[PDB]
Amino acid sequence: GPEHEFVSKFLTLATLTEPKLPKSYTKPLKDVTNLGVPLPTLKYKYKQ
């Protein structure tokens, strides 16, 4: 309920003006130097 209202308004304002980075934005892979931070492991093992 209230969450729906927040998400809807947030999205409306976040896109009021066109975002600095468009949806089609792609930093050339050859220019990537940092992969960010390690993500945690999934809390389950993988079954092959």
Partner: protein, 281 residues
């Protein structure tokens, strides 16, 4: 001469004299290397490795692959369609159960890093070795390579996570989020916004079809958010994408203020995104 050498080699392979075939090929290859006839060495070693692998002699096959990679380094072989093609061809013959499968793959990726403009390796090669690693049960490495791969890799990455999720027989919001968030964070980290949106769509589309959760689509100015009534984490994660796109500190702060818990669970990731997209130290 080389053709004759290969003929004798293949003959020994067919007769099952693997030891002799292996020993003689390395001796002749050694000679080409000493003569600095690297192209001759590469052709001999490459065909030799392929022959052993097709004959199910993994030990001798991988041994020659390592030899091939060392000469690639020695000869300063640049990463391109031809040099990569030889490796892709060998990978197709590698049994996912080879004891040293991982080391062979690492050697290939390392060479592509060293002789290309890609700090983390060639994306085309990544698409191929990523699938081989998955087959060999090296799931986190497969993920990393697919993340650093091509568009086809993005599709394979979504399949990996989707299939994994369906494996754990658990659809708690926290669990579905553990899988979904990896697509969102990884593509945000390497700034491939288009891949983030596509993978996101495929994953959510599939989740909807499979489990039929309660939801309502919210569309604004060409953007869409699938509001889940019982998957608040998924709502938060979808909003992250648009927020980083805006690079607006205010929205970032507003989003986190509304999702306090999730902001704590993803504290480390959000801190990185804070500096990456909002210039927040």
């Amino acid at each position: 001469k080389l053709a004759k050498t290969l003929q004798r080699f293949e003959n020994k392979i067919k007769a099952g004299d693997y030891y002799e075939a292996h020993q003689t090929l390395r001796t002749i290859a050694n000679r080409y290397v000493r003569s600095k006839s690297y192209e001759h060495a590469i052709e001999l070693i490459s065909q030799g490795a392929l022959s052993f692998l097709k004959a199910k002699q993994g030990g001798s096959g991988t041994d020659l692959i390592f030899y091939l990679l060392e000469v690639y380094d020695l000869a300063e072989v640049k990463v391109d369609d031809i040099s990569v093609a030889r490796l892709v061809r060998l990978i197709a013959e590698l049994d996912p159960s080879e004891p040293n499968l991982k080391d062979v793959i690492t050697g290939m990726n390392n060479w592509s890093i060293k002789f290309s403009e890609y700090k983390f390796g060639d994306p085309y090669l990544h698409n191929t070795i990523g699938s081989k690693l998955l087959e060999g049960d090296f799931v986190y490495e497969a993920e990393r390579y697919f993340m650093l791969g091509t568009h086809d890799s993005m599709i394979k990455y979504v399949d990996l996570l989707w299939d994994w999720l369906c494996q754990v027989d658990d659809i708690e919001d926290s669990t579905v989020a553990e899988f979904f968030s990896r697509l969102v964070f990884n593509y945000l980290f390497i700034s491939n916004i288009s891949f983030a949106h596509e993978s996101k769509d495929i994953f959510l589309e599939r989740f909807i079809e499979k489990f039929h959760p309660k939801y309502e689509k919210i569309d604004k100015n060409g953007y869409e958010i699938v509001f889940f009534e019982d998957y608040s984490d998924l709502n938060f994660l979808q909003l992250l994408l648009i927020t980083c796109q805006t690079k607006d500190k205010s929205y970032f702060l507003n989003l986190k203020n509304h999702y306090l818990d999730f902001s704590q669970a993803y504290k480390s990731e959000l801190e990185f995104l804070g500096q990456e997209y909002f210039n927040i130290v």
